[PDB]
Amino acid sequence: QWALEDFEIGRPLGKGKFGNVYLAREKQSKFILALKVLFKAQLEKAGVEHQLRREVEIQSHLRHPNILRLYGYFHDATRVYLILEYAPLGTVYRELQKLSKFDEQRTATYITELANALSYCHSKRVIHRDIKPENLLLGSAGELKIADFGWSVHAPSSRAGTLDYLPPEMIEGRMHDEKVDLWSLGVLCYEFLVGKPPFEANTYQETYKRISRVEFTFPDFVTEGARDLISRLLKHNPSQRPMLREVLEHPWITANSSKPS
Numbered sequence: 001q002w003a004l005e006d007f008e009i010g011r012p013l014g015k016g017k018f019g020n021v022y023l024a025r026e027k028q029s030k031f032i033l034a035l036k037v038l039f040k041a042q043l044e045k046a047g048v049e050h051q052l053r054r055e056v057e058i059q060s061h062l063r064h065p066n067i068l069r070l071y072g073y074f075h076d077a078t079r080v081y082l083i084l085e086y087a088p089l090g091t092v093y094r095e096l097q098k099l100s101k102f103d104e105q106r107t108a109t110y111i112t113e114l115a116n117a118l119s120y121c122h123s124k125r126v127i128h129r130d131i132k133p134e135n136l137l138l139g140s141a142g143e144l145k146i147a148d149f150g151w152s153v154h155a156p157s158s159r160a161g162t163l164d165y166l167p168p169e170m171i172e173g174r175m176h177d178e179k180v181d182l183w184s185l186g187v188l189c190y191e192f193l194v195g196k197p198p199f200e201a202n203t204y205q206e207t208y209k210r211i212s213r214v215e216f217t218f219p220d221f222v223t224e225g226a227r228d229l230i231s232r233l234l235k236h237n238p239s240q241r242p243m244l245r246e247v248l249e250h251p252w253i254t255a256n257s258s259k260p261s
């Protein structure tokens with residue numbers, strides 16, 4: 001049904017590995033949306049057809065205020081097009097670059113919105129596996145929305161870029177489950193408060209070392225409550241990481257967040 005002819009294309013919203021994402025408006029309805037463009041030659045070369053299929057099937061069926069909607073797709077012999085909800089206030093990544101660090105209230109609020117969306121995902125046994133600031137978008141009221149389900153799957157499971165958000169079991173090629181998303185949640189909470197992720201390093205090889213050893217320290221300004229939560233999430237043993245419910249009910253979260261479970 002849908003074809004390129006049905007849309008007017010506007011400015012670039014962002015660039016991805018395969019993805020090149022544009023603002024667009026549907027001609028008959030004037031509906032404003034985002035069009036994620038992937039080149040088939042690059043998809044075929046990388047051999048990532050299967051995860052593109054996953055992205056469409058999993059994201060199109062999820063329904064949650066804190067998850068970005070996917071409406072449909074089409075393709076045209078050189079390109080695939082994913083039709084997405086437009087997020088008008090951009091990425092959390094850009095916001096972090098602008099402010100350098102978030103305060104505790106802004107951080108706890110984002111963590112609550114994230115944990116709500118992840119709780120909904122895990123109840124359907126969907127694990128996201130690529131939670132990071134460039135994949136977190138902001139709606140018209142500044143609410144957080146998880147996007148980019150290009151690495152998502154069903155659990156249990158086995159398995160090019162940054163190691164910074166991945167847990168030890170995943171970077172060691174081992175087996176993993178839902179608890180990978182709780183680790184990434186810990187990494188994010190730290191990066192929000194401090195301005196850089198806790199295992200950041202100059203080379204791949206050494207980042208790998210800091211992650212497998214769980215080697216991180218806190219700057220003085222990080223408070224006791226934040227330290228307690230982050231320390232609970234960044235556990236080497238997956239089974240020792242908390243349930244999302246315990247994250248949403250953590251004293252530091254409840255004291256500082258401006259949104260409910």
Ligand SMILES: Nc1ncnc2c1ncn2[C@@H]1O[C@H](COP(=O)(O)OP(=O)(O)O)[C@@H](O)[C@H]1O
Binds near residue numbers: 088134
């Ligand atoms: N719906 C959207 N609204 C606004 N900006 C978006 C939207 N989707 C993607 N972007 C921008 O484009 C970038 C790449 O999108 P993404 O779907 O994450 O591609 P990739 O799978 O290649 O990472 C994002 O980091 C963001 O800057």
Ligand SMILES: [NH3+]Cc1ccccc1N1CCC(CO)CC1
Binds near residue numbers: 043049053056075
């Ligand atoms: N049919 C489009 C296409 C072209 C080239 C490579 C992969 C793909 N898909 C990804 C999306 C899938 C949704 O069903 C269909 C297969």
Ligand SMILES: [Mg+2]
Binds near residue numbers: 016134148
């Ligand atoms: Mg992305």
Ligand SMILES: [Mg+2]
Binds near residue numbers: 016148149150151
């Ligand atoms: Mg992707």
